[PDB]
């Protein structure tokens, strides 16, 4: 399922990057879209976790579950600094899945 995971990770990275751009900007309309990007991201990461679970990469599946919880923090409670830190952590992991 590596090819499937790579494709899901690319689309999840698109969501995460748009969210990071929203976090770093003060745009009244762009704050409404953050929840939509976040929910889409959570759906993708749940599927990535299952694909890892279907294989023998339990640690990677646990990473995917945590990233889903981080995005829940990003879209609800988190401060701008906390949002960016979690967004960057997410982006780093997705890049590792995409390029290796």
What Å resolution does this PDB entry report? 2.0
| Pick from 62, 42, 66, 46: nearest CA to 5 | 46
Interior/surface letters 15-41, b for 16+ CB within 10 angstroms, e for the rest? bbebbbebbeeeeeeeeeebeebbebb
Nearest-10 crossing angle of helices 2-23, 80-98: 160
- 3-state SS, one letter per residue, for the chain: CHHHHHHHHHHHHHHHHHHHHHHCCCCHHHHHHHHHHHHHHHHHHHHHHHHHHHCCCHHHHHHHHHHHHHHHHHHCCCCHHHHHHHHHHHHHHHHHHHCC
CB atoms within 10 A of CB 64: 27
First-to-last C-alpha distance (Å) of the chain: 13
Number of structural domains the chain divides into: 1
Whole-Å CA distances, 12 to 28, 81, 90, 91, 98:
24, 21, 9, 9, 10
CA separation for the pair 48, 54 (Å, rounded): 10
Method: X-ray
- Which domain range does residue 49 map to? 1-100
């Amino acid at each position: 399922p590596k090819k499937k995971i790579q494709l899901h990770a690319e689309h999840a990275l698109y969501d995460a990057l748009m969210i990071l751009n929203i976090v770093k900007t003060n745009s009244p309309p762009a704050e409404e879209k953050l929840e939509d990007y976040a929910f889409n991201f959570e759906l993708i990461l749940e599927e990535i976790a299952r694909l890892f679970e279907s294989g023998d990469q339990k640690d990677e599946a646990e990473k995917a579950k945590r990233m889903k919880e981080w995005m829940k923090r990003i879209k609800t409670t988190a401060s701008e600094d906390e949002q960016e830190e979690m967004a960057n952590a997410i982006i780093t992991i997705l890049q590792s899945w995409i390029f290796s």
